[PDB]
Enzyme design. Sequence first.
Site, PDB file in Angstrom:
ATOM      1  N   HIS A   1     -15.041  76.828  -4.513  1.00 55.45           N
ATOM      2  CA  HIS A   1     -14.533  75.578  -5.088  1.00 55.45           C
ATOM      3  C   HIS A   1     -13.059  75.646  -5.517  1.00 55.45           C
TER       4      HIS A   1
ATOM      5  N   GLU B   1     -10.971  77.119  -3.652  1.00 60.30           N
ATOM      6  CA  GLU B   1     -10.336  76.944  -2.347  1.00 60.30           C
ATOM      7  C   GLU B   1     -10.172  75.472  -1.976  1.00 60.30           C
TER       8      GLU B   1
ATOM      9  N   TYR C   1      -9.987  72.987  -4.130  1.00 63.81           N
ATOM     10  CA  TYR C   1      -8.945  72.470  -5.011  1.00 63.81           C
ATOM     11  C   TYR C   1      -7.545  72.920  -4.585  1.00 63.81           C
TER      12      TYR C   1
ATOM     13  N   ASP D   1      17.261  80.567  -1.729  1.00 64.49           N
ATOM     14  CA  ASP D   1      16.205  81.114  -0.890  1.00 64.49           C
ATOM     15  C   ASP D   1      14.997  81.391  -1.770  1.00 64.49           C
TER      16      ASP D   1
ATOM     17  N   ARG E   1     -27.959  69.331   7.904  1.00 66.18           N
ATOM     18  CA  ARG E   1     -26.745  69.864   8.490  1.00 66.18           C
ATOM     19  C   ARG E   1     -27.078  70.856   9.598  1.00 66.18           C
TER      20      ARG E   1
ATOM     21  N   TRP F   1     -19.674  78.120   7.877  1.00 73.86           N
ATOM     22  CA  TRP F   1     -18.535  78.726   7.199  1.00 73.86           C
ATOM     23  C   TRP F   1     -18.955  79.465   5.941  1.00 73.86           C
TER      24      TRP F   1
ATOM     25  N   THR G   1      -8.682  63.975 -12.683  1.00 71.86           N
ATOM     26  CA  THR G   1      -8.249  63.378 -11.426  1.00 71.86           C
ATOM     27  C   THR G   1      -8.377  61.861 -11.445  1.00 71.86           C
TER      28      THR G   1
ATOM     29  N   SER H   1      -2.360  87.213   3.447  1.00 71.11           N
ATOM     30  CA  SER H   1      -1.233  86.317   3.715  1.00 71.11           C
ATOM     31  C   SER H   1      -1.000  85.354   2.562  1.00 71.11           C
ATOM     32  N   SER H   2      -2.064  84.696   2.125  1.00 69.80           N
ATOM     33  CA  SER H   2      -1.947  83.706   1.072  1.00 69.80           C
ATOM     34  C   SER H   2      -1.764  84.303  -0.325  1.00 69.80           C
TER      35      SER H   2
ATOM     36  N   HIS I   1     -14.791  75.495  13.977  1.00 73.14           N
ATOM     37  CA  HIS I   1     -14.146  74.267  13.522  1.00 73.14           C
ATOM     38  C   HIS I   1     -13.815  74.341  12.042  1.00 73.14           C
TER      39      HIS I   1
ATOM     40  N   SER J   1       2.263  61.972  -4.732  1.00 71.57           N
ATOM     41  CA  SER J   1       3.044  61.570  -5.899  1.00 71.57           C
ATOM     42  C   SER J   1       4.519  61.394  -5.554  1.00 71.57           C
TER      43      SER J   1
ATOM     44  N   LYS K   1      -5.142  60.952 -12.875  1.00 72.94           N
ATOM     45  CA  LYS K   1      -4.119  61.019 -11.826  1.00 72.94           C
ATOM     46  C   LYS K   1      -4.155  59.816 -10.888  1.00 72.94           C
TER      47      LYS K   1
ATOM     48  N   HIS L   1     -22.445  74.118  -8.519  1.00 73.49           N
ATOM     49  CA  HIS L   1     -22.895  72.873  -7.918  1.00 73.49           C
ATOM     50  C   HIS L   1     -23.108  73.011  -6.418  1.00 73.49           C
ATOM     51  N   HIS L   2     -22.673  74.115  -5.813  1.00 74.47           N
ATOM     52  CA  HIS L   2     -22.990  74.377  -4.419  1.00 74.47           C
ATOM     53  C   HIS L   2     -24.327  75.084  -4.236  1.00 74.47           C
TER      54      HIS L   2
HETATM   55  C1  HEA Z   1     -10.562  68.298  -0.623  1.00 72.04           C
HETATM   56  C2  HEA Z   1     -11.552  69.122  -0.899  1.00 72.04           C
HETATM   57  C3  HEA Z   1     -12.561  68.773  -1.925  1.00 72.04           C
HETATM   58  C4  HEA Z   1     -12.448  68.053  -3.171  1.00 72.04           C
HETATM   59  C5  HEA Z   1     -11.365  67.401  -3.989  1.00 72.04           C
HETATM   60  C6  HEA Z   1     -13.831  68.045  -3.686  1.00 72.04           C
HETATM   61  C7  HEA Z   1     -14.124  67.451  -4.874  1.00 72.04           C
HETATM   62  C8  HEA Z   1     -15.362  67.384  -5.439  1.00 72.04           C
HETATM   63  N1  HEA Z   1     -16.486  67.914  -4.865  1.00 72.04           N
HETATM   64 FE1  HEA Z   1     -16.648  68.875  -3.147  1.00 72.04          FE
HETATM   65  N2  HEA Z   1     -16.796  69.848  -1.438  1.00 72.04           N
HETATM   66  C9  HEA Z   1     -15.796  70.131  -0.562  1.00 72.04           C
HETATM   67  C10 HEA Z   1     -14.481  69.792  -0.709  1.00 72.04           C
HETATM   68  C11 HEA Z   1     -13.990  69.112  -1.787  1.00 72.04           C
HETATM   69  N3  HEA Z   1     -14.713  68.668  -2.856  1.00 72.04           N
HETATM   70  C12 HEA Z   1     -16.292  70.885   0.608  1.00 72.04           C
HETATM   71  C13 HEA Z   1     -15.321  71.284   1.685  1.00 72.04           C
HETATM   72  C14 HEA Z   1     -17.717  71.049   0.418  1.00 72.04           C
HETATM   73  C15 HEA Z   1     -18.713  71.722   1.329  1.00 72.04           C
HETATM   74  C16 HEA Z   1     -19.217  73.052   0.815  1.00 72.04           C
HETATM   75  C17 HEA Z   1     -20.519  73.352   1.514  1.00 72.04           C
HETATM   76  O1  HEA Z   1     -20.494  73.624   2.730  1.00 72.04           O
HETATM   77  O2  HEA Z   1     -21.574  73.308   0.848  1.00 72.04           O
HETATM   78  C18 HEA Z   1     -17.923  70.372  -0.884  1.00 72.04           C
HETATM   79  C19 HEA Z   1     -19.165  70.312  -1.427  1.00 72.04           C
HETATM   80  C20 HEA Z   1     -19.461  69.728  -2.613  1.00 72.04           C
HETATM   81  C21 HEA Z   1     -20.862  69.733  -3.079  1.00 72.04           C
HETATM   82  C22 HEA Z   1     -22.062  70.360  -2.418  1.00 72.04           C
HETATM   83  C23 HEA Z   1     -23.172  69.375  -2.110  1.00 72.04           C
HETATM   84  C24 HEA Z   1     -24.349  70.162  -1.603  1.00 72.04           C
HETATM   85  O3  HEA Z   1     -24.196  71.369  -1.328  1.00 72.04           O
HETATM   86  O4  HEA Z   1     -25.438  69.573  -1.484  1.00 72.04           O
HETATM   87  C25 HEA Z   1     -20.734  69.037  -4.337  1.00 72.04           C
HETATM   88  C26 HEA Z   1     -21.807  68.724  -5.306  1.00 72.04           C
HETATM   89  O5  HEA Z   1     -21.821  67.718  -5.974  1.00 72.04           O
HETATM   90  C27 HEA Z   1     -19.311  68.667  -4.494  1.00 72.04           C
HETATM   91  C28 HEA Z   1     -18.804  67.994  -5.564  1.00 72.04           C
HETATM   92  C29 HEA Z   1     -17.503  67.646  -5.723  1.00 72.04           C
HETATM   93  C30 HEA Z   1     -17.066  66.906  -6.917  1.00 72.04           C
HETATM   94  C31 HEA Z   1     -18.093  66.545  -7.952  1.00 72.04           C
HETATM   95  C32 HEA Z   1     -15.645  66.722  -6.751  1.00 72.04           C
HETATM   96  C33 HEA Z   1     -14.629  66.055  -7.618  1.00 72.04           C
HETATM   97  O6  HEA Z   1     -13.466  66.862  -7.851  1.00 72.04           O
HETATM   98  C34 HEA Z   1     -14.223  64.685  -7.091  1.00 72.04           C
HETATM   99  C35 HEA Z   1     -13.395  63.911  -8.108  1.00 72.04           C
HETATM  100  C36 HEA Z   1     -12.407  63.100  -7.312  1.00 72.04           C
HETATM  101  C37 HEA Z   1     -12.205  61.781  -7.463  1.00 72.04           C
HETATM  102  C38 HEA Z   1     -11.202  61.120  -6.569  1.00 72.04           C
HETATM  103  C39 HEA Z   1     -12.937  60.959  -8.495  1.00 72.04           C
HETATM  104  C40 HEA Z   1     -11.925  60.432  -9.509  1.00 72.04           C
HETATM  105  C41 HEA Z   1     -11.676  58.949  -9.317  1.00 72.04           C
HETATM  106  C42 HEA Z   1     -11.904  58.007 -10.246  1.00 72.04           C
HETATM  107  C43 HEA Z   1     -11.602  56.579  -9.910  1.00 72.04           C
HETATM  108  C44 HEA Z   1     -12.457  58.339 -11.612  1.00 72.04           C
HETATM  109  C45 HEA Z   1     -13.978  58.319 -11.576  1.00 72.04           C
HETATM  110  C46 HEA Z   1     -14.501  57.999 -12.947  1.00 72.04           C
HETATM  111  C47 HEA Z   1     -15.767  57.606 -13.114  1.00 72.04           C
HETATM  112  C48 HEA Z   1     -16.731  57.483 -11.968  1.00 72.04           C
HETATM  113  C49 HEA Z   1     -16.230  57.296 -14.494  1.00 72.04           C
HETATM  114  N4  HEA Z   1     -18.581  69.104  -3.438  1.00 72.04           N
HETATM  115  C1  HEA Z   2      -9.714  70.717   7.052  1.00 69.56           C
HETATM  116  C2  HEA Z   2     -11.020  70.536   7.111  1.00 69.56           C
HETATM  117  C3  HEA Z   2     -11.656  69.633   8.099  1.00 69.56           C
HETATM  118  C4  HEA Z   2     -11.158  68.553   8.919  1.00 69.56           C
HETATM  119  C5  HEA Z   2      -9.851  67.844   9.153  1.00 69.56           C
HETATM  120  C6  HEA Z   2     -12.358  68.109   9.660  1.00 69.56           C
HETATM  121  C7  HEA Z   2     -12.301  67.082  10.557  1.00 69.56           C
HETATM  122  C8  HEA Z   2     -13.361  66.609  11.286  1.00 69.56           C
HETATM  123  N1  HEA Z   2     -14.634  67.113  11.209  1.00 69.56           N
HETATM  124 FE1  HEA Z   2     -15.281  68.598  10.084  1.00 69.56          FE
HETATM  125  N2  HEA Z   2     -15.931  70.074   8.955  1.00 69.56           N
HETATM  126  C9  HEA Z   2     -15.208  70.815   8.084  1.00 69.56           C
HETATM  127  C10 HEA Z   2     -13.879  70.680   7.818  1.00 69.56           C
HETATM  128  C11 HEA Z   2     -13.087  69.750   8.417  1.00 69.56           C
HETATM  129  N3  HEA Z   2     -13.474  68.831   9.344  1.00 69.56           N
HETATM  130  C12 HEA Z   2     -16.035  71.834   7.420  1.00 69.56           C
HETATM  131  C13 HEA Z   2     -15.371  72.735   6.425  1.00 69.56           C
HETATM  132  C14 HEA Z   2     -17.375  71.693   7.939  1.00 69.56           C
HETATM  133  C15 HEA Z   2     -18.617  72.478   7.592  1.00 69.56           C
HETATM  134  C16 HEA Z   2     -18.913  73.520   8.658  1.00 69.56           C
HETATM  135  C17 HEA Z   2     -20.265  74.128   8.406  1.00 69.56           C
HETATM  136  O1  HEA Z   2     -21.277  73.416   8.568  1.00 69.56           O
HETATM  137  O2  HEA Z   2     -20.323  75.320   8.048  1.00 69.56           O
HETATM  138  C18 HEA Z   2     -17.197  70.569   8.886  1.00 69.56           C
HETATM  139  C19 HEA Z   2     -18.260  70.110   9.597  1.00 69.56           C
HETATM  140  C20 HEA Z   2     -18.206  69.095  10.494  1.00 69.56           C
HETATM  141  C21 HEA Z   2     -19.438  68.702  11.202  1.00 69.56           C
HETATM  142  C22 HEA Z   2     -20.806  69.307  11.021  1.00 69.56           C
HETATM  143  C23 HEA Z   2     -21.462  69.756  12.305  1.00 69.56           C
HETATM  144  C24 HEA Z   2     -22.897  70.038  11.959  1.00 69.56           C
HETATM  145  O3  HEA Z   2     -23.128  70.661  10.905  1.00 69.56           O
HETATM  146  O4  HEA Z   2     -23.792  69.625  12.725  1.00 69.56           O
HETATM  147  C25 HEA Z   2     -18.940  67.609  12.016  1.00 69.56           C
HETATM  148  C26 HEA Z   2     -19.625  66.720  12.977  1.00 69.56           C
HETATM  149  O5  HEA Z   2     -19.681  65.521  12.767  1.00 69.56           O
HETATM  150  C27 HEA Z   2     -17.506  67.464  11.728  1.00 69.56           C
HETATM  151  C28 HEA Z   2     -16.718  66.533  12.329  1.00 69.56           C
HETATM  152  C29 HEA Z   2     -15.389  66.381  12.075  1.00 69.56           C
HETATM  153  C30 HEA Z   2     -14.606  65.349  12.766  1.00 69.56           C
HETATM  154  C31 HEA Z   2     -15.301  64.460  13.756  1.00 69.56           C
HETATM  155  C32 HEA Z   2     -13.263  65.482  12.262  1.00 69.56           C
HETATM  156  C33 HEA Z   2     -12.022  64.717  12.566  1.00 69.56           C
HETATM  157  O6  HEA Z   2     -11.362  64.227  11.388  1.00 69.56           O
HETATM  158  C34 HEA Z   2     -11.047  65.472  13.461  1.00 69.56           C
HETATM  159  C35 HEA Z   2      -9.699  64.766  13.427  1.00 69.56           C
HETATM  160  C36 HEA Z   2      -8.748  65.618  12.627  1.00 69.56           C
HETATM  161  C37 HEA Z   2      -7.456  65.749  12.943  1.00 69.56           C
HETATM  162  C38 HEA Z   2      -6.874  65.036  14.128  1.00 69.56           C
HETATM  163  C39 HEA Z   2      -6.593  66.638  12.081  1.00 69.56           C
HETATM  164  C40 HEA Z   2      -5.265  65.966  11.772  1.00 69.56           C
HETATM  165  C41 HEA Z   2      -4.147  66.771  12.387  1.00 69.56           C
HETATM  166  C42 HEA Z   2      -3.052  66.188  12.894  1.00 69.56           C
HETATM  167  C43 HEA Z   2      -2.877  64.697  12.866  1.00 69.56           C
HETATM  168  C44 HEA Z   2      -1.975  67.051  13.496  1.00 69.56           C
HETATM  169  C45 HEA Z   2      -1.127  67.650  12.386  1.00 69.56           C
HETATM  170  C46 HEA Z   2       0.158  68.145  13.005  1.00 69.56           C
HETATM  171  C47 HEA Z   2       1.362  67.742  12.574  1.00 69.56           C
HETATM  172  C48 HEA Z   2       1.500  66.774  11.437  1.00 69.56           C
HETATM  173  C49 HEA Z   2       2.592  68.276  13.241  1.00 69.56           C
HETATM  174  N4  HEA Z   2     -17.099  68.367  10.805  1.00 69.56           N
HETATM  175 CU   LIG Z   3     -17.348  72.445  -5.087  1.00 73.60          CU
END
Ligand code: HEA
Ligand code: HEA
Ligand SMILES: [Cu+2]
Lengths: 54, 75, 227, 514, 46, 43, 95, 79, 259
Positions: free
Chosen positions: D240, D242, D244, D91, D438, D126, D316, D156-157, D61, D255, D319, D290-291
């Site tokens: 991290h 990835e 972003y 192109d 988890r 993962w 952000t 690819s990427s 998944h 935007s 933004k 932080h991970h």
């Molecule tokens: C879309 C993907 C995405 C994005 C944007 C982020 C953004 C951020 N992520 Fe995350 N992160 C993941 C995807 C993402 N992450 C994934 C996939 C994991 C799982 C990895 C794993 O398996 O361990 C993960 C895990 C992860 C962890 C691991 C936790 C753990 O292992 O126990 C942490 C730790 O703090 C973290 C932090 C953050 C922070 C601090 C930001 C920041 O960039 C967020 C900032 C964004 C905002 C929108 C806030 C801004 C808004 C405001 C209004 C301003 C706020 C101002 C004040 C509060 C003064 N991320």
């Molecule tokens: C892209 C990243 C992504 C997305 C969308 C989701 C979506 C969802 N995830 Fe996932 N999830 C992860 C990334 C994502 N997850 C990762 C990275 C982990 C950690 C794995 C690990 O533990 O190692 C995780 C783990 C994770 C767990 C942890 C299992 C466990 O550890 O026990 C669970 C269970 O609740 C879960 C549930 C779901 C559910 C219920 C959705 C739902 O939102 C599903 C619905 C989503 C969609 C329907 C997608 C939208 C697509 C379309 C609408 C079609 C687009 C096509 C066109 C526009 C033409 N996710």
């Molecule tokens: Cu991170």
Amino acid sequence: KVPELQKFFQKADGVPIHLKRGLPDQMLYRTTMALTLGGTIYCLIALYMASQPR
Amino acid sequence: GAGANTWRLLTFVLALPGVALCSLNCWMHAGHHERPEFIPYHHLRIRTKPFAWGDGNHTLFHNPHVNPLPTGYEH
Amino acid sequence: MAYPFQLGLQDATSPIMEELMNFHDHTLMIVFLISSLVLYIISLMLTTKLTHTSTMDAQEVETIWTILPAVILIMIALPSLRILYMMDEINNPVLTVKTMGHQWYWSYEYTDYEDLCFDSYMIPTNDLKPGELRLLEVDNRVVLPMELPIRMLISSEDVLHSWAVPSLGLKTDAIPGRLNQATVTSNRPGLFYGQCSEICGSNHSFMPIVLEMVPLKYFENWSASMI
Amino acid sequence: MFINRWLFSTNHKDIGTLYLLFGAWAGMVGTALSILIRAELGQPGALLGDDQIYNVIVTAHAFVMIFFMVMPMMIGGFGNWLVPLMIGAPDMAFPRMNNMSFWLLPPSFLLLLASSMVEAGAGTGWTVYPPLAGNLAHAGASVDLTIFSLHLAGVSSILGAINFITTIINMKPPAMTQYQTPLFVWSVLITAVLLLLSLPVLAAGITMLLTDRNLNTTFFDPAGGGDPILYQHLFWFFGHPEVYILILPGFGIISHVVTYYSGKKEPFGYMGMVWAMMSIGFLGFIVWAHHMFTVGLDVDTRAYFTSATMIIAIPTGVKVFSWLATLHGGNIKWSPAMLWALGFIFLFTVGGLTGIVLSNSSLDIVLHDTYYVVAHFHYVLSMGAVFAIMAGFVHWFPLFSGFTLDDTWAKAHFAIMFVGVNMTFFPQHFLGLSGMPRRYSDYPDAYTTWNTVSSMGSFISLTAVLIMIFMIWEAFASKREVMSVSYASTNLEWLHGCPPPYHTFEEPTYVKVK
Amino acid sequence: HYEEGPGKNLPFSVENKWRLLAMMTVYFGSGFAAPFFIVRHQLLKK
Amino acid sequence: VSAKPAKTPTSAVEQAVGISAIVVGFMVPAGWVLAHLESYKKS
Amino acid sequence: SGGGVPTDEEQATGLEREIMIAAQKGLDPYNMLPPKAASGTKEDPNLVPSISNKRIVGCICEEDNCTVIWFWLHKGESQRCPNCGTHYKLVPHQM
Amino acid sequence: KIKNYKTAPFDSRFPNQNQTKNCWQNYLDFHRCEKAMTAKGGDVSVCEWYRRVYKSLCPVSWVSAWDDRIAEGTFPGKI
Amino acid sequence: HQTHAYHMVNPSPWPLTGAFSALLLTSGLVMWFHYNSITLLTLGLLTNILTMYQWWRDVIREGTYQGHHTPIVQKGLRYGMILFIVSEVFFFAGFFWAFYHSSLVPTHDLGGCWPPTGISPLNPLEVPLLNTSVLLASGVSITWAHHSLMEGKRNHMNQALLITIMLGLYFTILQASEYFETSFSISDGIYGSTFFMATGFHGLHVIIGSTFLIVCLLRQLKFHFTSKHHFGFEAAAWYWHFVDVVWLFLYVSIYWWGS
Ligand code: HEA
Ligand code: HEA
Ligand SMILES: [Cu+2]
Ligand code: CUA
Ligand SMILES: [Mg+2]
Ligand code: NA
Ligand SMILES: [Zn+2]
């Protein structure tokens, strides 16, 4: 020998440049695509055979 | 800058005579050492998964004169 | 340990988890505040009939726009760094316990004096005594004295585990070839329930940790009895 | 005729179409995996039995949703369709490398599927942490096929990133600067920069993991001299960046959508957008540990890293507040893509704030690998990235296909999508706070009720994507055309009609400085 | 030259609603049914 | 975005057939393999 | 040792030859450099050449402006920029 | 003496979370004290305290493995 | 027609063929490490070499015989290779980070010192300095080759590229012959793992650079390169400077420091 290959490759035949030499490019393109199709289907056969246990 | 004869002079003074001098220096230091006595270490010569060429215990560049097996040397 | 319809954290026993809970309440109040800002502004400024769709001064509000989230992040981060430094004091412990995470079970060595060691496996669901907990009861509970500094050195034999007890505020990686340290104290006796937090195979859900914390004299009697 | 048009294709629109098709298929594969996961977690007990097959489903998944739904659709499909249309290029610079990147993608998918099919199974999460991913716990060919899937997707990427940076930097008109380009062009520039700056790190990391598995090295073996903390360092140094990458073209898409459907001629503070995207890109490279707040680092190291999370929280915030500020005094047209963008803003704010709660290492002692992390990353990924994909799809489906969607069905799809995801991922906060770890296939009874609620929400999201398919069919069941598009002067991609022809910009744009 | 216009820039014909509905449901249903048959396969193994 | 009147407009019944086709074509295979897991566990 | 290596004034062919031949007389028919003859008035408009009946024209009609605005320009009289009104006229005869 | 040793103390030279180097260096320091005062020929049990340090600090699997490799003569530590 | 100075490519199979070739390499490594089959791996290797030969031969045909290579096109190709080079920088930097983290804090199983007990490292003042000097001399000879290309010298260019190519061949056979007779193997701990991975990947990259130099030579002997539009030779100089500064970092990091 470059300006006379330049005359050869500037032709309005509509052919792409990897079939423009005529016989030999067509020959190794055909053999390349044939061996990669055979390799791909034997790869899927190998993967399906490896998926099953003994 | 952007000359052509001065770079030929530069390489023909510095590069090839320097490589030849270093080749002679490595020729006069071309002497092997004796085989060290073997101790069955545990972080050296591991075998977790067998190799996929030949037997499976020999490495790709395993010269039997210097490289030891985990069960000692080869004779 | 957890009860049904629980929203917040498990309540604290160690001092460390009391300060962690107070900081969690602080930062969640801050999150509620700024989420209220974002939600009220997006609800406000799409609900008007007045329009202004011309050239606007691009840079005339950015100083407050930049210093307000910086000052709120500083206000978050200063107690964060304070409690971050509150976990690395001079411990001067009383007991030292060693845990090794074997392949889907735990092993415990109390070997400060008169070397004692045992294994912890889960009591199975079909072999539960009445009243016990599913997926949270072990064969041998892990007995410690209470209100004392106890060093707890955590490692594993083969793969990555995570020795975690939430209610005492402990979670430490069990890494093979590496010995991490935690300190554990208490303020109340009783049984505290944790479980593994690192992926470790096909029974990863099936290794719990039960910390039974008793007085010192009963810990001495238990240590004399178990050897 | 078909083979030369599609299998041998050398223009950007066709490759973007094939991206959209492949990513829709792979996204529905991932949706089936997510339904399987929430079906295991619905009631107490083991519907599937052991945790090994559940971990296989979880890892599948994660990989299918990360590298095969958001990644190709978002970056490749929207960049290839829109970037030579936004900058006025005929192109891409290297179209053959773009075609090669597409055709490397389904080999990677087939290798991932074969990794799942082999009886060992790649049930590691993962994160592919050794010694769980070694040749002792997973002695077999599943982890190797997983590693080569990641290799093929990475190559690819990197090829796509190289092609994107050269076609953005070079293929502009000679009068326009880099600060006169649209915002999505900037987002995919910075995305391609971090892609080629981050991907070889995981390429080397999983190469050394492969040689540890099959060439008898001790890179991560503690009994030979190495340690798995090195693998964690390299993996999160990619990881991290990835995420972003996963979120930045979404920023560009939202935007563009918020700028268009509010009636604005430009986003408010374009320089602020550009500065904040380059700040997020530059500053995502030094926040990786932080991970690993529970691995046992130095206390000073984690102090530095949580300060790094705060200083990456600020731009952000600039933004999102400027996204709010460009809604001021606009003719707010209530399009479906507007609803997707506002849901993006709110739910991405909630996900980022939960990430800021997680950012403190003191509370990351408690909340590491609980469901609070799962709620954080789903509120950013499964809501922000998915809502941005849907906003771009709804906004540019007239451009790609030539027909307009039924907006009433689109608003209904947004409504049930929002309800499904919000009911899926809000009890996970309470489950993380209560302390469920988890990767668990069975939980104690006290975690039952929220799990039950969470399972129900997943099925609602299924209904959402089910009717989504009908939406697409309804467009091709209606064949309603486009006479005209509003605000076609500012947006360049709408100026050739819907759909644009095969050969565009043979006569290029006329823009002058002096 | 290749076809230009609405509905012709796509790799599949859209001139009939019903065969295209069948095409969409078999394509996306094969997508939805692949991991379920995978899970059936590892359950059937052991 | 302005929209033309539909060249081949569908009615309500054909859209009902379409949504029922999507539902049945998505719930027969997954529902069938979920309808008996213990048969695969050698019941 | 003499020459031998050819210069690109006889060996280069095709489109490179076309741009090298036309660019040595100050002419850019293949659009590599920003254009010239700039005046916005209706008697001396901004001239744009083409090979077809219309061309996409992008106006940056004040400096330090982010968004270029694009508009089609056809044959006939001088059309205007759709926010500033600088006059653009199409003369489609180049090659 | 320094006896009535209840447990291992807080070592200021290694105050962080990782504690491999503490028990590793204490085991080699016990063996080096044993070698040094066997060469000196005096009372080698005065650093018996050091022995109890690795009784309390790193696990008995590690200590048993190290005893086995130092009995066979495959000890990477220089003693 | 076409008025933009960009290049429009004809439809091409080598994306598809090279992509399925990469699939064949991945599946060939899997079937070799686990099932001991050579045939699929060799079929994939043949498919790569045929695909790459056809692709680069056709790029040669557009760039040399049809004249599609505008200055904007050469600028784009320069940007693309520079990005590829930076990607390889970060690949080798990940390997360097692995070695530095391995050797900065030695573990208890090694004994706590670098080098580990039971290994005999290669001291740097013997024959590795010969191969550093060989790569440096090849860089100097290719700089003279580039300057003779811009100046307009042909026979000086031929002599310079010939000595550059034969010193590259001397370097790779010298490294291979030294790695026949090294005193430690791949299974000799983290030192052997880091050392052999870094030097093997550098050897693969220098044999790639040698092959690119050879095809540059056979292009130059058929008068492909003119006085200024000679981007293949500029590419050869750039990749060669890449590979010997990478070897300079390896020789400073592994061979000299810590041994
Ligand atoms: C879309 C993907 C995405 C994005 C944007 C982020 C953004 C951020 N992520 Fe995350 N992160 C993941 C995807 C993402 N992450 C994934 C996939 C994991 C799982 C990895 C794993 O398996 O361990 C993960 C895990 C992860 C962890 C691991 C936790 C753990 O292992 O126990 C942490 C730790 O703090 C973290 C932090 C953050 C922070 C601090 C930001 C920041 O960039 C967020 C900032 C964004 C905002 C929108 C806030 C801004 C808004 C405001 C209004 C301003 C706020 C101002 C004040 C509060 C003064 N991320
Ligand atoms: C892209 C990243 C992504 C997305 C969308 C989701 C979506 C969802 N995830 Fe996932 N999830 C992860 C990334 C994502 N997850 C990762 C990275 C982990 C950690 C794995 C690990 O533990 O190692 C995780 C783990 C994770 C767990 C942890 C299992 C466990 O550890 O026990 C669970 C269970 O609740 C879960 C549930 C779901 C559910 C219920 C959705 C739902 O939102 C599903 C619905 C989503 C969609 C329907 C997608 C939208 C697509 C379309 C609408 C079609 C687009 C096509 C066109 C526009 C033409 N996710
Ligand atoms: Cu991170
Ligand atoms: Cu041990 Cu999970
Ligand atoms: Mg962990
Ligand atoms: Na279950
Ligand atoms: Zn104007």
